[PDB]
Chain A
Amino acid sequence: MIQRTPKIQVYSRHPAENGKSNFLNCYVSGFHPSDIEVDLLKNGERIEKVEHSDLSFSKDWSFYLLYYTEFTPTEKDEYACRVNHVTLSQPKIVKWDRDM
């Protein structure tokens, strides 16, 4: 029917300071239908201990979810959010940029 592909933002709860514990967030929104798969990645590897918010939706009926996990950023570790949805032919990977 109507299908809407997810918007994705990857960011931290607090401003990033290397060596200080923080939370890594992947906010997925604007999507329909509601079935979605999200992984948070560290240096390409799936983080196992990832929690998510309860499924809700916006006034235009599109769904949104927050996936988050504790992390301690460093200069050289890389982090990302990997999302699959029926509207995507292959998973979409969005890398964490601490300036965004």
Chain B
Amino acid sequence: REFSKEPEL
């Protein structure tokens, strides 16, 4: 299951 907090570059 995926990471839920991908941030903006």
Give yes or no for direct A-B contact (beta carbon below 8 Å): no
